[PDB]
Amino acid sequence: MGSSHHHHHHSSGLVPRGSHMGRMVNLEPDMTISKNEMVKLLEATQYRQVSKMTRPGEFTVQANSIEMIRRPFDFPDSKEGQVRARLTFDGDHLATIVNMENNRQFGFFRLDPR
After folding, report:
1. Is the backbone of residue 59 left (phi > 0), alpha (psi -120 to 50) or beta?
2. The total number of structural domains that make up the chain
3. Are 89 and 98 in contact (CB under 8 A)?
4. Which residues make beta-bridge pairs with 105?
5. Contact 41/66 with Cβ under 8 angstroms?
6. Percentage helix, strand, coil for the chain under 3-state DSSP, each rounded to 5
7. Cα 55–Cα 88–Cα 71 angle in degrees, nearest 5
């Protein structure tokens, strides 16, 4: 058990408010994204937010960004080494991504949804 955030009140009959799944992965700065869009990124890095992360298959969603560590994934379209990426929101919408190792700018971080 690590970073166990409780208070999971399921919306039994989520008719109002609208659809809120969001599941979207294509990291491309100046995109309008959420923990719920990147959620898939997070399901992709197969992780859940941490106070602090560093291992393959993590991320952090806390303040202005959704960070991440690409665990080795065996996808035909995506199979590489680990990367710490900084998905920084202009508040509501992702503005930039930064390679947290070099602190260089992104503008492409592509995942393979699943």
Report:
1. beta
2. 1
3. no
4. 98
5. yes
6. 5, 25, 70
7. 25
CA distance 36 to 25: 10
The per-residue b/e assignment along 73-102, b for 16 or more CB within 10 angstroms, e otherwise, is: beeeeeeeebbbbbbbbeeeebbebbebee
Residue 41 DSSP label: H
**Residues comprising the chain, all counted:** 114
Structure tokens at 71: 């665990």
Structural domain including 112 reads: 1-114
Contacts by 31-37, CB closer than 8 A, 24 or more apart: 31/93, 31/94, 32/92, 32/93, 32/94, 33/66, 33/87, 33/89, 33/93, 33/94, 35/61, 35/66
SS3 for 104? strand
Q: What letter would DSSP give residue 13?
A: T
CA distances to 1, 5, 75, 90 from 11, in Å = 24, 17, 34, 28
With H, G, I as helix, E, B as strand and everything else as coil, classify residue 108: coil
The tokens for 94 are: 């992702």
